[PDB]
Write a protein that binds this ligand. Sequence first.
Ligand code: NDP
Ligand code: 4XN
Ligand code: CL
Length: 632
Amino acid sequence: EQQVPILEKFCFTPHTEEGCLSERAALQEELQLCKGLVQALQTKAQIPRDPSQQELPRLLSAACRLQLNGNLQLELAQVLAQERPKLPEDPLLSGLLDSPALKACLDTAVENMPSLKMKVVEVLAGHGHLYSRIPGLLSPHPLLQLSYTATDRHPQALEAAQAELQQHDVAQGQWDPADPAPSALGSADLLVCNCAVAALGDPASALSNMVAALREGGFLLLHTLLRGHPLGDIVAFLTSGQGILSQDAWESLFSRVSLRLVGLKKSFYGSTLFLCRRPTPQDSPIFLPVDDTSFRWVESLKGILADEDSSRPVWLKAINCATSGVVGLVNCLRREPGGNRLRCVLLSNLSSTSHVPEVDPGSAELQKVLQGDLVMNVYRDGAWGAFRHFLLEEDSKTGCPAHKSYIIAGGLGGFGLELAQWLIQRGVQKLVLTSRSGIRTGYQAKQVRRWRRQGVQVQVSTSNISSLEGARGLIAEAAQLGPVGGVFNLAVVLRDGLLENQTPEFFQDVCKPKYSGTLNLDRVTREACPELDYFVVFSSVSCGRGNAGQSNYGFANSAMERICEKRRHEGLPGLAVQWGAIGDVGILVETMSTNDTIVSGTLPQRMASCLEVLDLFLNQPHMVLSSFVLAE
Ligand SMILES: NC(=O)C1=CN([C@@H]2O[C@H](COP(=O)(O)OP(=O)(O)OC[C@H]3O[C@@H](n4cnc5c(N)ncnc54)[C@H](OP(=O)(O)O)[C@@H]3O)[C@@H](O)[C@H]2O)C=CC1
Ligand SMILES: Cn1ncc2cc(-c3ccc(C4=NC5(CC5)C(=O)N4C[C@@H]4CCN(C(=O)C5CC5)C4)cc3)ccc21
Ligand SMILES: [Cl-]
């Protein structure tokens, strides 16, 4: 019966995060217990619910048992070797793998792929078990194809997992990281290794051979435990394995093998996800500002990317506009010809208090960004990072007071009429629907006639929000009916086409109702709408994910999202909703059809689902949300 959409929040995510998982009391308690069981040792049942029933506490207690009589010094080899393959499921030894930290690293890798494909190799999968996590974490990507190979030194180490491996199209191989990689595993896009449990052996040699297996620009994801931290020291004590190094040692090792560090997730107890990258021979970068409002820079970019012969990296710089939509622009152009040449920098501070770093050609900061060579480089309030998607949690209902006015920009549109209907039946008695040319269809006129016959005061306005004057006039109209309780920007103009077929004027057209419109709506509601409860813009997966031939559209949407973020930061209402394909009504169904037409591995979301999801979203504290329905 009902569709089940995937719901996510779109958050700015620092490259470096520390103290992670500190809010997980179940982990805090378990860590305390383990700390006790080692201080005891040195000095001398249903699903595990209490922190003492977990794998590592169990092992430690069994080592106290031996410590009493049978002697751990003699039996440790058989107990450790016994419970070894089960230890990676300990909550602490896999906290980061279970957290969104893993997803954040994987998505960073995917984002920096030149195409929607990734060749993956897992080292020491027999105890790493990352093959049972990564494919599932990336399966929501409707287009991404993975080529995954699980490898290990001892061919039998992956025997008990032959079923799941083969059944989920994961290839198997033999590789001791001590040696060089089989040539077949070469030119890998991503090498992963969970050596929190797995015997890494000599890490210097191991890392050297891993890098060699990566392509230039390829990524290494390493999960491990740090010396000088509690969990690392505890696991080390049980070792009497080798491969448990301090962070300084790790970073020295990365330098020694040329690995560039570009990501770092550290838990409060010292478990760590290193995201490293093999360098690409730095060709002289090109630097193009995109802050020019005339979008003249579009013509410049046309010329640059027209040069098919060149491999010059193209860096788009947005340093004088926090509400730039460069991120959305890039997500689209990356899917267009020469898109792999693209990177970007975006200075987007939410606080005017915050310091702006200098990223002119020749700065330490800019050179540091270049060495990383990441596609997405967003500076925000003291931290470098990028917007990432994360699984929204579960969570009341939406009712509107009869005396408040509600505005829908683009209200006579497909989604707009359905939104008006939904708002009404949630109590709305005062509606203002805007349109550049007023009513134009019998369908539109009919719904308005109905709503009026029901008693709903429905005004149809032509006050163009793309202008500050027209905007100001619009809220005046709504005010004449009652205090503006909410605004909903559903206005859109399309000027699709590859960038080679784009113009600055087309970009201006597309940005008029979305970018300029939402700016003016932000300004006037701040001034004259003190009872505004809702400030909702409708964005798209075209912005949040990217879509060839819609770069201007991605830009406009992305800019709206930035505005919403600033608004929420200042306590004002604000919400961008990245919609996937929408069935029943709207532009898409006009070309064409509701159900049947699979759209890039996703399905048009039925309006029933859409409104149900919108209800959930309107009652969230998050700035940017996403909804789409996966096909198959
Ligand atoms: N349809 C889909 O599948 C998806 C849609 N979205 C977003 O959802 C929203 C609505 O989608 P949808 O119903 O399909 O599109 P529609 O084209 O059906 O309706 C939106 C309307 O905006 C009006 N409009 C354009 N410019 C202005 C302006 N300056 N002031 C006032 N009205 C204006 C247009 O009509 P007119 O020219 O007469 O003024 C059009 O009727 C948009 O923001 C779109 O980007 C996102 C993802 C998927
Ligand atoms: C989790 N995840 N990861 C990656 C990813 C990518 C997408 C995704 C889906 C669809 C498209 C897409 N394809 C076409 C050409 C047919 C197309 O038109 N689109 C854009 C959709 C369908 C219509 N859309 C609009 O915004 C219309 C202009 C109003 C959105 C683009 C990307 C979704 C989720 C994703
Ligand atoms: Cl790239």
